[PDB]
Ligand binder design. Structure first.
Ligand SMILES: O=c1cnn([C@@H]2O[C@H](COP(=O)(O)O)[C@@H](O)[C@H]2O)c(=O)[nH]1
Ligand SMILES: O=c1cnn([C@@H]2O[C@H](COP(=O)(O)O)[C@@H](O)[C@H]2O)c(=O)[nH]1
Lengths: 212, 237
């Protein structure tokens, strides 16, 4: 099946970002580009990564606005070339639907963020996570994001979304999540700092590929 | 901060030429412009510095920051380096995520606006239920600027009760979203208007008309005087 390792490229300058992604090109086929890089180098960086690496791109933009603005953000992001975009479910169904409509029109994918992996996630997001996942199912969402740091929550999310839904999980490495335990429930893991901060990113990526 | 005429333009057009033209047509009425991702993702972050260079207006980056602490810090640094005076941050992700933003703003001398409740229908599903707690979290963290819904003025008064009168509160949803400017300005310090102005056949006339409606509420310009006014409005509410 698919490669189970996704690189979160959150370096903030083009030279370092391109150099490091190039070094691990052999180990990953999907790169998640977020605002740290986009706000520092521009949306054109998406097209450049696709040209240089031939990878799929997930725009980790945590879309969380009203429907009208969400539609605009998705349209600009897919025109820039991203294959998928990560959307927050907490702002509600209408906001998620606006994203899905644009994705359906352009043949792209929406990933719904159900529960985040950081400590602060326990304050409000965790309590809404199961309902958000259910909302996703009701809306026809097929791609989800869940926390590597809480495997029991990942298990519960998997129960709600089913075996056919695709689940990716961040929080591996720097945040404390374990690749193996995470992959008992998620289809793929997201790894950022553990790879990109390393003196030898290729060796770091290779090591993760090894343990899984 | 003090917002001229209590009106903030939400400039969500997606091309530079139209955005600069409309803002230029209404600059005599406002001194605060809110720029979000529709414009930034289309024209680049350099658009913020261009607006500051051209108009001298205050710029609030409406980025709805909602990531983990580490990423939030990066987004705020990049945004403030680009010229934004303030940034809007979501509180649903928790206290550590908001704190990360506040620390950068404190270090760089900028401001953080905490979004407590959104104005769209979907806000009722999860946000509204967490809104009072998010506002209290903001108070506990030292947050001094907030965003609340013009579409639910009664929710705004409750929010105002939690944050006090010294906190600055702005509110979107007026115009296209159907929000009530009059009831909203009993509680918020300023309203945000996007489409009703930028999609108008004459943006300047649209802005002028809204300001006339605001001036008719007889809201004091002096902060101390409006504080007294707001205290009485809240007691009545
Ligand atoms: O619940 C979470 C936690 N983290 N991330 C993102 O995944 C990456 C994780 O990076 P890291 O491996 O360096 O901690 C970063 O881009 C981060 O914003 C999410 O999208 N959701
Ligand atoms: O709770 C809300 C609702 N809307 N907005 C934003 O405020 C503006 C309102 O625009 P409008 O006047 O065209 O409806 C847009 O930029 C929108 O993303 C918020 O920040 N928070």
């Amino acid at each position: 099946v698919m490669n189970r390792l996704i690189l979160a490229m959150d370096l903030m300058n083009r030279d370092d970002a391109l150099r490091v992604t190039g070094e691990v090109r052999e180990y990953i086929d999907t790169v998640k580009i977020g605002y740290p890089l986009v706000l520092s180098e521009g949306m054109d960086i998406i097209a450049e990564f696709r040209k240089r690496f031939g990878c799929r791109i997930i725009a980790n933009f945590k879309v969380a606005d009203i429907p009208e603005t969400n539609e605009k953000i998705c349209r600009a992001t897919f025109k820039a070339g991203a294959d998928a975009i990560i959307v927050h479910g907490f702002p509600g169904a209408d906001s998620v639907r606006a994203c899905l409509n644009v994705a359906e029109e352009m043949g792209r994918e929406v990933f719904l963020l159900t529960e985040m992996s950081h400590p602060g996630a326990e304050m409000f997001i965790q309590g809404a996570a199961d309902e958000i996942a259910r909302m996703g199912v009701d809306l026809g969402v097929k791609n989800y994001v869940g926390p590597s740091t809480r495997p029991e929550r990942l298990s519960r999310l998997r129960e709600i979304i089913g075996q056919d839904s695709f689940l990716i999980s961040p929080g591996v490495g720097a945040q404390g999540g374990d690749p193996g335990e995470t992959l008992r429930f998620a289809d793929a893991i997201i790894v950022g700092r553990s790879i990109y901060l390393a003196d030898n990113p290729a060796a770091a990526a290779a090591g993760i590929i090894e343990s899984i």
